Short mmCIF file of C-alpha atoms and ligand atoms in Angstrom, two decimals:
data_model
loop_
_atom_site.label_atom_id
_atom_site.label_comp_id
_atom_site.label_asym_id
_atom_site.label_seq_id
_atom_site.Cartn_x
_atom_site.Cartn_y
_atom_site.Cartn_z
CA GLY A 1 98.20 81.61 93.91
CA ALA A 2 100.39 78.47 93.45
CA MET A 3 101.69 77.90 90.09
CA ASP A 4 102.91 82.04 90.17
CA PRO A 5 105.75 83.74 90.21
CA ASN A 6 106.91 85.24 93.62
CA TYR A 7 104.17 82.75 95.66
CA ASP A 8 103.44 83.76 99.41
CA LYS A 9 101.83 81.79 101.63
CA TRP A 10 100.67 84.41 103.78
CA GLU A 11 98.39 85.74 101.02
CA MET A 12 94.72 85.05 102.34
CA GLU A 13 91.45 86.20 100.58
CA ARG A 14 89.93 89.33 102.15
CA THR A 15 86.51 87.58 101.62
CA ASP A 16 87.50 84.71 104.60
CA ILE A 17 87.49 87.68 107.32
CA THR A 18 84.00 89.43 108.38
CA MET A 19 84.97 92.73 110.11
CA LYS A 20 83.22 93.78 113.18
CA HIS A 21 83.71 97.47 114.13
CA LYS A 22 87.08 99.03 115.18
CA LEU A 23 89.15 97.86 118.29
CA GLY A 24 88.23 100.31 121.22
CA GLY A 25 91.63 100.73 122.75
CA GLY A 26 92.39 104.46 122.46
CA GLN A 27 91.75 103.60 118.37
CA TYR A 28 94.55 101.86 117.03
CA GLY A 29 93.43 103.72 113.64
CA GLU A 30 91.94 101.53 111.56
CA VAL A 31 92.30 98.42 113.10
CA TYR A 32 89.23 96.17 113.38
CA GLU A 33 87.81 92.99 115.46
CA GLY A 34 87.32 90.30 112.73
CA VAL A 35 86.04 87.08 112.63
CA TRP A 36 87.55 84.21 109.86
CA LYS A 37 84.57 82.42 109.08
CA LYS A 38 86.04 79.17 108.19
CA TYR A 39 87.93 78.83 111.75
CA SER A 40 85.17 80.00 113.75
CA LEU A 41 88.28 82.63 114.48
CA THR A 42 88.38 86.07 115.95
CA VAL A 43 91.34 88.11 114.59
CA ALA A 44 92.47 91.56 114.25
CA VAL A 45 92.51 93.24 110.95
CA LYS A 46 94.73 96.48 110.75
CA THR A 47 93.71 98.08 107.83
CA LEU A 48 94.56 101.38 105.54
CA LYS A 49 92.43 103.50 103.64
CA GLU A 50 93.03 107.33 104.95
CA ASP A 51 96.94 107.66 104.74
CA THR A 52 99.37 107.20 101.31
CA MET A 53 102.64 108.00 103.02
CA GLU A 54 102.19 104.85 104.67
CA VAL A 55 100.94 102.44 101.88
CA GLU A 56 104.82 101.69 101.35
CA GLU A 57 105.43 101.97 105.25
CA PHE A 58 102.53 99.26 105.71
CA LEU A 59 104.07 96.97 103.51
CA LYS A 60 107.27 97.16 104.93
CA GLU A 61 105.68 96.33 108.58
CA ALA A 62 103.65 93.36 106.47
CA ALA A 63 107.78 92.35 105.29
CA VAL A 64 108.85 92.44 108.93
CA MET A 65 105.96 90.77 110.51
CA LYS A 66 106.57 87.65 108.23
CA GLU A 67 110.59 87.42 109.62
CA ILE A 68 109.23 86.72 113.43
CA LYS A 69 107.91 84.56 115.33
CA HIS A 70 107.47 83.83 118.77
CA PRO A 71 104.99 82.75 121.49
CA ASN A 72 105.21 86.34 123.43
CA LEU A 73 105.51 88.14 119.62
CA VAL A 74 101.65 89.00 118.71
CA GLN A 75 101.39 86.94 115.79
CA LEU A 76 100.85 86.99 112.05
CA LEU A 77 97.89 85.16 110.49
CA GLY A 78 97.97 86.39 107.19
CA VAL A 79 97.98 89.63 104.84
CA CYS A 80 96.35 90.92 101.82
CA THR A 81 98.44 92.92 99.91
CA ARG A 82 97.33 92.08 96.49
CA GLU A 83 94.12 94.49 95.69
CA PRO A 84 93.64 97.90 96.67
CA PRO A 85 92.45 97.95 100.55
CA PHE A 86 95.20 96.13 102.45
CA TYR A 87 94.71 93.95 105.53
CA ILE A 88 97.55 92.59 107.93
CA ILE A 89 96.03 89.83 109.90
CA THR A 90 96.67 89.10 113.13
CA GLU A 91 95.62 86.90 116.27
CA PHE A 92 93.24 88.65 118.75
CA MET A 93 94.24 88.96 121.97
CA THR A 94 91.19 88.68 124.58
CA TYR A 95 92.25 91.45 127.20
CA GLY A 96 93.43 94.38 124.65
CA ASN A 97 96.50 96.26 125.23
CA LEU A 98 98.87 95.78 128.66
CA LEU A 99 98.78 99.38 129.81
CA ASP A 100 94.99 99.40 130.15
CA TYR A 101 94.48 96.28 131.51
CA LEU A 102 97.22 96.78 134.43
CA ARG A 103 95.03 99.72 134.73
CA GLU A 104 91.70 97.99 135.25
CA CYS A 105 92.52 94.82 136.44
CA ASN A 106 91.89 93.47 140.03
CA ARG A 107 95.01 93.29 141.95
CA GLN A 108 94.46 90.25 143.71
CA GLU A 109 94.47 88.35 140.66
CA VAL A 110 97.20 90.01 139.17
CA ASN A 111 99.02 89.52 142.21
CA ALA A 112 102.76 90.12 142.60
CA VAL A 113 103.77 86.99 141.41
CA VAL A 114 101.65 87.66 137.75
CA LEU A 115 103.54 90.68 137.23
CA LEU A 116 106.73 88.87 137.36
CA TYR A 117 105.46 86.35 134.96
CA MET A 118 104.33 89.01 132.36
CA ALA A 119 107.70 90.58 133.32
CA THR A 120 109.56 87.05 132.36
CA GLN A 121 107.23 86.98 129.19
CA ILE A 122 108.37 90.10 127.42
CA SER A 123 112.15 89.71 128.54
CA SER A 124 111.99 86.28 126.96
CA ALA A 125 110.17 88.15 123.59
CA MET A 126 112.57 90.60 123.58
CA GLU A 127 115.64 87.90 124.21
CA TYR A 128 114.35 86.74 120.46
CA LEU A 129 113.99 89.84 118.87
CA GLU A 130 117.62 90.50 120.68
CA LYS A 131 118.79 87.27 119.08
CA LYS A 132 117.33 88.04 115.57
CA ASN A 133 118.92 91.41 115.53
CA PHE A 134 115.57 93.14 115.16
CA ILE A 135 115.39 96.76 117.07
CA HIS A 136 111.42 97.14 118.34
CA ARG A 137 112.29 100.80 118.78
CA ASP A 138 108.79 101.54 121.01
CA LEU A 139 108.78 99.15 123.81
CA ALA A 140 106.17 100.25 126.22
CA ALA A 141 103.00 98.64 128.06
CA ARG A 142 100.62 100.51 125.62
CA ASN A 143 102.31 97.87 122.82
CA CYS A 144 101.82 94.82 124.95
CA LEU A 145 98.61 92.52 124.51
CA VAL A 146 97.26 90.58 127.44
CA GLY A 147 95.35 87.36 126.56
CA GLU A 148 94.12 84.28 128.62
CA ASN A 149 96.28 83.47 131.73
CA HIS A 150 98.39 86.40 132.02
CA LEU A 151 99.57 85.76 128.57
CA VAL A 152 101.62 88.58 127.63
CA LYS A 153 102.86 89.15 123.94
CA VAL A 154 105.10 92.20 122.48
CA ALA A 155 103.62 94.07 119.58
CA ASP A 156 103.91 97.58 117.75
CA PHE A 157 100.70 99.27 117.04
CA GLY A 158 102.32 102.82 115.37
CA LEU A 159 101.54 104.83 118.31
CA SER A 160 103.47 107.27 117.53
CA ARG A 161 100.74 108.62 114.61
CA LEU A 162 97.52 107.83 116.67
CA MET A 163 98.78 109.76 119.84
CA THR A 164 96.44 112.10 121.42
CA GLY A 165 98.29 113.69 124.17
CA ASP A 166 101.51 114.11 126.21
CA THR A 167 103.30 110.52 125.50
CA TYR A 168 104.71 111.42 121.77
CA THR A 169 105.95 114.71 121.48
CA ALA A 170 107.09 116.48 118.38
CA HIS A 171 110.61 116.07 117.59
CA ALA A 172 111.14 116.81 113.58
CA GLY A 173 108.11 114.96 111.94
CA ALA A 174 109.43 111.85 114.27
CA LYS A 175 107.49 111.33 117.30
CA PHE A 176 109.48 110.60 120.46
CA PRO A 177 108.39 108.63 123.61
CA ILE A 178 110.67 110.51 125.67
CA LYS A 179 110.02 109.19 129.05
CA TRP A 180 110.53 105.49 127.47
CA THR A 181 113.52 107.04 125.30
CA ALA A 182 117.10 106.01 126.29
CA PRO A 183 119.41 109.61 126.57
CA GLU A 184 121.73 108.13 123.48
CA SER A 185 118.04 107.83 121.34
CA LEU A 186 117.20 111.31 122.53
CA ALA A 187 120.57 113.20 122.24
CA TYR A 188 122.13 111.38 119.58
CA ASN A 189 119.34 109.61 117.27
CA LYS A 190 121.13 106.17 118.15
CA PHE A 191 118.60 102.85 118.29
CA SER A 192 119.87 99.81 119.17
CA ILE A 193 118.61 96.57 121.49
CA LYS A 194 120.27 98.39 124.32
CA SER A 195 117.98 101.25 123.70
CA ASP A 196 115.32 98.45 123.71
CA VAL A 197 116.63 97.52 127.16
CA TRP A 198 116.26 101.21 128.62
CA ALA A 199 112.84 100.93 127.30
CA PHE A 200 112.41 97.41 128.92
CA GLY A 201 113.50 99.04 132.70
CA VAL A 202 110.68 101.74 132.40
CA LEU A 203 107.94 99.06 131.19
CA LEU A 204 108.89 97.18 134.12
CA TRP A 205 108.38 100.41 136.23
CA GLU A 206 104.54 100.75 134.35
CA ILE A 207 104.17 97.11 135.16
CA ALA A 208 105.49 97.02 139.36
CA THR A 209 103.26 100.74 139.77
CA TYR A 210 100.14 99.17 137.87
CA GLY A 211 100.21 101.08 134.69
CA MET A 212 100.87 104.86 136.39
CA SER A 213 102.49 107.06 133.68
CA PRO A 214 106.77 107.23 133.84
CA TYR A 215 108.75 110.14 135.96
CA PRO A 216 105.26 111.52 137.96
CA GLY A 217 104.90 115.38 137.79
CA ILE A 218 108.16 115.87 136.36
CA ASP A 219 107.46 117.23 132.79
CA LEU A 220 109.08 116.29 129.73
CA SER A 221 111.57 119.16 128.91
CA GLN A 222 113.81 118.07 131.96
CA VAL A 223 113.93 114.52 131.91
CA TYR A 224 117.07 114.17 130.24
CA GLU A 225 118.94 116.73 132.24
CA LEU A 226 117.70 114.55 135.17
CA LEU A 227 119.01 111.62 133.86
CA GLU A 228 122.35 113.20 133.19
CA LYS A 229 122.74 113.72 136.65
CA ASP A 230 122.11 110.29 137.27
CA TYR A 231 118.34 110.38 138.34
CA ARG A 232 115.89 107.25 138.08
CA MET A 233 113.06 106.81 139.00
CA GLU A 234 112.23 105.63 142.32
CA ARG A 235 111.35 101.67 143.80
CA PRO A 236 107.56 101.66 143.09
CA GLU A 237 105.60 100.43 146.41
CA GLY A 238 105.65 96.87 146.86
CA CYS A 239 108.38 95.88 143.96
CA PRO A 240 111.30 93.78 144.97
CA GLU A 241 114.63 94.79 145.50
CA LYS A 242 115.84 92.18 142.95
CA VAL A 243 113.11 93.80 140.25
CA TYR A 244 114.05 97.44 141.39
CA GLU A 245 118.35 96.08 140.96
CA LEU A 246 117.59 95.09 137.48
CA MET A 247 115.55 98.09 136.55
CA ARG A 248 118.22 100.34 137.27
CA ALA A 249 120.62 97.78 135.13
CA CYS A 250 118.95 98.79 132.24
CA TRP A 251 118.84 102.23 133.35
CA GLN A 252 122.85 102.46 133.19
CA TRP A 253 123.75 105.73 131.19
CA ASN A 254 126.20 103.94 129.00
CA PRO A 255 124.22 101.44 126.71
CA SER A 256 127.13 99.11 127.02
CA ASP A 257 126.56 98.11 130.57
CA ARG A 258 123.07 97.63 130.20
CA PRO A 259 122.13 93.73 130.52
CA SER A 260 121.52 91.93 127.13
CA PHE A 261 117.61 90.41 127.46
CA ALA A 262 119.21 87.04 127.40
CA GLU A 263 120.41 87.94 130.72
CA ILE A 264 117.41 89.88 131.46
CA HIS A 265 115.60 86.72 131.01
CA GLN A 266 117.68 84.34 132.92
CA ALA A 267 117.32 86.58 136.09
CA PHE A 268 113.62 86.24 135.55
CA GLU A 269 113.98 82.60 135.24
CA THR A 270 115.89 82.45 138.15
CA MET A 271 113.87 84.69 140.12
CA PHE A 272 110.83 82.47 139.21
CA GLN A 273 111.05 80.26 142.61
CA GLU A 274 107.58 80.77 144.44
C1 7MP B 1 96.08 94.49 113.20
C2 7MP B 1 97.53 93.94 114.12
C3 7MP B 1 98.51 94.04 112.61
C4 7MP B 1 99.88 94.13 112.64
C5 7MP B 1 100.11 94.31 114.05
N1 7MP B 1 101.88 94.08 114.07
C6 7MP B 1 102.63 94.65 115.40
O1 7MP B 1 102.07 94.81 116.28
C7 7MP B 1 104.05 94.82 115.08
C8 7MP B 1 104.60 95.38 114.26
C9 7MP B 1 105.42 95.18 113.79
C10 7MP B 1 106.87 94.55 114.79
C11 7MP B 1 106.20 94.43 116.07
C12 7MP B 1 107.21 93.28 116.76
F1 7MP B 1 108.34 93.92 116.73
F2 7MP B 1 106.84 94.04 118.07
F3 7MP B 1 106.82 91.99 117.02
C13 7MP B 1 104.39 93.93 115.77
C14 7MP B 1 99.78 94.06 115.23
C15 7MP B 1 98.37 94.36 115.16
N2 7MP B 1 97.30 94.12 116.16
C16 7MP B 1 96.94 93.20 117.14
C17 7MP B 1 95.78 93.23 117.72
C18 7MP B 1 95.67 91.86 118.66
N3 7MP B 1 95.22 91.77 119.67
C19 7MP B 1 94.72 92.85 120.15
N4 7MP B 1 93.52 92.91 121.25
N5 7MP B 1 94.93 94.51 119.59
C20 7MP B 1 95.84 94.33 118.18
N6 7MP B 1 95.93 95.25 118.06
C21 7MP B 1 95.56 96.86 118.28
C22 7MP B 1 96.61 95.44 116.50
O2 7MP B 1 97.20 96.59 115.93
#
């Protein structure tokens, strides 16, 4: 509605999108595969009709997505927050989440140099968020998406609500991904760009291991104590020593010592010969 107070270019007609069925990928809740009829365009449509403490948090999500734009950040297309069944319309990434992809991929195709390119793309998205003073809070393979040509977008699916298993452990109603969470976020509940950097190093290990769970075989209860004793994950099989040295950088105990995504990104840019 144009000539009306509080205009919004992101507001679209719910009528313009057909909803197929829920996106399968371990179910993201009320998130459907859609088609924007006019444009013959497949989209992802996050809805809401089961939560109601969410409603207000559903619209904070929408607002946040309006303020961010990067080629490696999942792209908002439109919202429907005018009438009851609210939509958040996003581009559709052909190959679902980055965790399953790495786990199910052909490794001849997703060869050494693809894995690095996927990593360079994420650091790019995060250098952007960093530039923007945006704290992501849940950087993990499960929150990334894979398009055509090994294209990786960083996203956020609200998975501490979805969780069925041992990835998000209960922590005062707040659910935490312990094995991705930095020590300061664990002990003192302080999140910042530098706590995203720590998560990044874990995600880099997820990528190099083709989607293996962090700290294999060790239980959650003893993760922090180990880190306190300066125990980090060891170099994955086949991983460059310069990629690993960067992992260890992100995993520095002191947050002020961890690289910026600026300097992580340039490291990937520099490394990008061959
Ligand atoms: C439908 C939807 C609506 C909103 C969002 N929002 C985010 O991913 C997001 C929310 C807040 C912040 C961020 C960011 F900081 F990481 F950019 C990202 C994602 C989606 N979304 C998108 C998908 C696109 N492609 C595919 N294959 N799956 C998708 N899923 C499961 C989604 O939830």
